[PDB]
Amino acid sequence: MHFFSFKDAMVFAFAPPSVLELGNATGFDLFLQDQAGVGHEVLLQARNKF
Amino acid sequence: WGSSYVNDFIDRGRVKRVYLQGRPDARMNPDDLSKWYVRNDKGEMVPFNA
C-alpha cells in the first residue's frame, strides 16, 4: 500500500520463500528459446504474445 | 596458402569464424606460387620467384 502511490517506479514487496537456497518455491518457471535462429525481435514478440 | 583465422563474426545469431586465404586457382601448381607479390621497404611489389 505505502508504495502503491509512486507513478515513477514499480516497487514489488515480498517475503522470501522459507528455503532460501531454492530461490522461488511457487508456481512455475520456463524459458522461451530461439531455436531456428529467428532473432531477438521475434523472440521478444513471442514473449509478449505468450 | 595456409588459410587464416583473423577474428569472429555473427551468423543467424551465432559466433562463427572468418577465414582468409588465397583463392583456389592461385595455389594449385607451384607456379601459382610465383603469382604472389610482397611489398618491400621502399613501397614496391616484389614477386615470389625473385
Residue A43: Cβ within 10 Å count: 14
As given in the structure block, the three cell numbers for residue A14 are 515480498
Residue for cell digits 596458402?
Answer: B1
Spell out where chain B has E strands.
4-11, 14-20, 37-40, 44-47
As given in the structure block, the three cell numbers for residue A31 are 524459458
Contact A34 B13 (CB under 8 A): yes
Chain A residues whose CB is inside 8 A of the B16 CB are none
Q: How far apart are CA A14 and CA A48, in angstroms?
A: 25
Documented resolution in Å: 3.2
Q: How far apart are CA A11 and CA A5, in angstroms?
A: 10
- List the single residue in A with minimal CA-CA distance to B13: A37
What residues are paired with A46 via a beta bridge?
none
Q: How far is A25 from chain B (nearest CA, A)?
A: 33
